[PDB]
């Protein structure tokens, strides 16, 4: 598509959290909506700033909602005066999931940026996923004969920081972040987190299938198509060729691990030699 990856800077996250908190101080709200400013680098979005805009909606009806687009334009001008290279690239809202009226809001935003990106930023501290979920509006051409509609195609979202922004984040995360853990422990923790995320995704798919089976949701006929491919992609690890290749590869890596460990042991013995010699010299001169 027109968007390959959306990089959301920590300043955007902090601004969104602050906007949500200051609006929610009123004690009666569900979500807040603002505008996202960034630059364009190849096909990778670089969402780097944001500003709040007045917004309200009805709890029952989805067609009733007000967004101050004049406020949008005025603050776009004010921000453009400060930073001309940051242009409107989309919008954000803090609702935990999508809304039925999100397509209308994206249509409103598309005038200012034709390829607008909606970045749902969950203020609640989710334990596994990233707080950002990026979507772009696409015209879904169905093959069932149903008329073409506008949907939100998901986009891989990442959190990246500028050099000074990273410096500030590390200053704010100085105490909390533990960097003493070695690289190997970090990779193993990454594997654990990947297992947890895969379990969560599979549980979401299972819950959707459970709802479909009991009739809570209709058969999409497109999620089923994707799920058949997913189950077909499950490799057979019991094949003789695969097992032999896996064993050969594991032995090829284990011989390297053995060589590295042997060299490490010899170097450790050399260190012990140096320590003992230094201790004996220190006690001999004293």
């Amino acid at each position: 598509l027109a968007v390959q990856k959306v990089v959301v800077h920590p300043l955007v996250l902090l601004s969104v959290v602050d906007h949500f908190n200051r609006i929610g101080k009123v004690g009666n709200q569900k979500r807040v909506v603002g505008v996202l400013l960034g630059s364009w680098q190849k096909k990778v979005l670089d969402v780097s700033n944001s500003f709040a805009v007045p917004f309200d909606e009805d709890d029952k009806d989805d067609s009733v909602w007000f967004l101050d687009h004049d406020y949008l334009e005025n603050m776009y001008g004010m921000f453009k005066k400060v930073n001309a290279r940051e242009r409107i690239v989309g919008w954000y809202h803090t609702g935990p999931k999508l809304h039925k009226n999100d397509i209308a809001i994206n249509e409103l935003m598309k005038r200012y940026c034709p390829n607008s990106v909606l970045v749902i930023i969950d203020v609640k501290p989710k334990d596994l996923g990233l707080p950002t979920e990026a979507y772009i509006s696409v015209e879904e051409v169905h093959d069932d004969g149903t008329p073409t509609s506008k949907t939100f195609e998901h986009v891989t979202s990442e959190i990246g920081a500028e050099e000074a922004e990273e410096v500030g984040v590390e200053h704010l995360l100085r105490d909390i972040k533990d960097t003493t853990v070695g690289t190997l422990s970090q990779r193993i923790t990454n594997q654990v987190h990947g297992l947890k995320g895969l379990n969560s995704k599979l549980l979401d798919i299972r819950s959707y299938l459970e709802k479909v089976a009991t009739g809570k949701l209709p058969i999409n006929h497109q999620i089923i198509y994707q799920l058949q491919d997913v189950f077909n992609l499950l490799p057979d690890v019991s094949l003789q060729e695969f097992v032999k290749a896996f064993y050969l590869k594991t032995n090829d890596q284990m011989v390297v691990v053995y060589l590295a460990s042997l060299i490490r042991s010899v170097v450790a013995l050399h260190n012990l030699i140096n320590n003992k010699i230094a201790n004996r010299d220190a006690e001999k001169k004293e």
């Binding site: 309200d56 909606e57 009805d58 009733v64 909602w65 007000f66 967004l67 101050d68 004049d70």
Partner: protein, 189 residues
């Protein structure tokens, strides 16, 4: 008075009719030009904005202490779709809830020139909801008043309650120009 207003102009199909000279669309354009000017000279701090009442409501311009932009927006307003009075009033109320200065007073100008295709219960509940937030909605009952004179009657009666002329139901029978009936109406008084 220090109040903020938002005009609920109608751009339905029935605005193409030549009942009001020269056309109902041009007639409501002149009426909007008059009412926004009146609200501007009533108080220099007053806020005016334009909300359309097409098939789907679209806030053309939010509240602003400016007049020419309102007519600039109205110039491009083409007659399309069917009136949706239920959602338009709530969209306008949402807009007034986010005015620049909260010390301003509620006010909505409604230009109904097409039949309201809703049950009376929805209208009375909307009127009660607006009355709770002290919202005053002034409705011009031109166009199809022969069918809307009852629903709007209940709307205005429930909005104003029993005391105070917070909102009016100025009904302009077809003639030379409904704007010529506006300057004698309590809307601009």
């Amino acid at each position: 008075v220090l109040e903020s207003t938002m005009v609920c102009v109608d751009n339905s199909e029935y605005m193409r009719n030549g009942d009001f000279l020269p056309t109902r669309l041009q007639a409501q354009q002149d009426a909007v030009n008059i009412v926004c000017h009146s609200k501007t000279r009533s108080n220099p701090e007053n806020n005016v904005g334009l909300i359309t009442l097409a098939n789907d409501c679209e806030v053309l311009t939010t509240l602003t202490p400016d007049t020419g932009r309102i007519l600039s927006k109205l110039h491009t307003v083409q007659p399309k779709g069917k009136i949706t009075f239920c959602t338009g009033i709530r969209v306008a109320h949402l807009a007034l809830k986010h005015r620049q200065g909260k010390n301003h007073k509620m006010r909505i100008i409604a230009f109904v020139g097409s039949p309201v295709e809703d049950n009376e219960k929805d209208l009375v509940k909307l009127a009660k909801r607006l009355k709770k937030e002290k919202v005053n909605v002034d409705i011009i009952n031109f166009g199809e008043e022969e069918v809307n004179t009852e629903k709007l009657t209940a709307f205005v009666n429930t909005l104003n309650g029993k005391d105070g002329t917070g909102s009016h139901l100025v009904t302009v029978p077809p003639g030379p120009s409904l704007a010529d009936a506006l300057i004698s109406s309590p809307i601009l008084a």
